[PDB]
Design a protein around this ligand. Structure first.
Ligand SMILES: Nc1ncnc2c1ncn2[C@@H]1O[C@H](COP(=O)(O)OP(=O)(O)CP(=O)(O)O)[C@@H](O)[C@H]1O
Ligand SMILES: Nc1ncnc2c1ncn2[C@@H]1O[C@H](COP(=O)(O)OP(=O)(O)CP(=O)(O)O)[C@@H](O)[C@H]1O
Ligand SMILES: [Mg+2]
Ligand SMILES: [Mg+2]
Lengths: 212, 205
């Protein structure tokens, strides 16, 4: 009714700030890129050209020039190797490993068995999920003081679900949502999924997100 | 707001930043590897077949020039870039001059014409040079504010103004500076009271 009309409106303004902030982003990069890969790539222009001119007039210098070109091609693509490494993102496969290591070295038993694991989930969600995960684990090896920790990750419905439970005690007060907690929620929620918790026996984190 | 705000910020930031890396690799990858290949192949045929070699290098120049342009168009549109470069340029010159550079980004510019940005850059650089030329001051305050419609640099130095009473000789950056701001319908003023003080103004647009 009235509530539907005013949600449509609320979505329109969200999106509007979206496009704007994404733009400002396109930019930080515009400066870095231009600097580096721009001087270099203009130089590639010039040596290309100059090489073509000297092919006959002087095939020696021509060659030497092409040597320098290939050099700068390669290293430039190397710069973007160093660049799409960033925000390329971690895949859970990797985050699970990381955490198995952190839990072992925490003095804690890591309970797992690969259960109905994920396919054709957006790479992005994979990053977020990776994050919340790492944070949850840290919280546990920070306060729970549990000695064992169960975890499963399943493709339920059209929605993916991690669950991370620890036998320790939840050291938090009644409203310590002050911190990777508010962080976690804020996140999943923005991805239109959910985060839930139970301090019944130790601490239990259910993260959910849309997949299929 | 402290965090709902700039947390959802930094998250759409990362949303599209992953998208942006997939586009780098996609576009400039394919392209730049192809540049590798044609470079190489060109070197091989320089003699065996200098014709094909040339043709290959033509296609190379095309691509190298082309890749920069997509990024470049965004850069031309973007504002505040000229001033930032100038600040970096002058901070360096002042440091290396033996001089303290006083600054704090104060109500800095948005949607000023790119042109005015260049002019202002200029007068600025010239002002600085004059200081590190004659003022022999040891510290130098500078601010750049968006005052109402009009933008204003102010560049002050504690040294002494070595100039005579009417040192505004043409072809010197003084007559040059005025000539300029004034042609842009803004203004230039100075005070030799304590050291030297330059107020540049111009229209924001
Ligand atoms: N798995 C767990 N076991 C026991 N206590 C936990 C827990 N997860 C969170 N807590 C408690 O809840 C409170 C809030 O945690 P939150 O995640 O906001 O910050 P933190 O203490 O984990 C450090 P950071 O915010 O840097 O990760 C903490 O005071 C912590 O002791
Ligand atoms: N900030 C400053 N401090 C002290 N003296 C200054 C000054 N700016 C200018 N002057 C004096 O006024 C004169 C005019 O300076 P101006 O910058 O107009 O010409 P210039 O001597 O720098 C050569 P150019 O043509 O390269 O600018 C200078 O010769 C100098 O003696
Ligand atoms: Mg935490
Ligand atoms: Mg001068």
């Amino acid at each position: 009714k009235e509530r539907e009309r005013l949600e449509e409106k609320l979505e329109d303004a969200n999106e509007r700030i979206a496009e704007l902030v994404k733009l400002e982003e396109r930019q930080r990069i515009a400066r870095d890129l231009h600097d580096t890969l721009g001087q270099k790539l203009s130089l590639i222009g010039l040596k290309s050209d100059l090489a073509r001119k000297l092919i006959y007039k002087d095939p020696e210098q021509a060659a030497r020039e092409l040597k320098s070109v290939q050099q700068t091609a390669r290293t430039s693509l190397n710069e973007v190797r160093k660049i799409v490494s960033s925000m390329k993102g971690i895949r859970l496969k990797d985050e699970l490993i990381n955490i198995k290591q952190i839990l072992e070295a925490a003095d804690i038993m890591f309970i797992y068995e690969e259960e109905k694991w994920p396919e054709n989930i957006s790479l992005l969600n994979e990053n977020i999920l990776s994050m919340c995960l790492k944070e949850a684990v840290t919280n546990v090896v920070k306060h729970s003081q549990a000695k064992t920790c169960r975890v499963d990750i399943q493709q339920l419905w059209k929605e993916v679900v991690i669950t991370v439970s620890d036998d320790g005690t939840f050291k938090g007060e009644e409203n310590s949502f002050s911190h990777g907690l508010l962080g976690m929620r804020e996140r999943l929620e923005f991805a239109n999924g959910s985060l839930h918790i139970d301090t019944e026996n130790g601490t239990k984190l259910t993260m959910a997100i849309p997949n299929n």
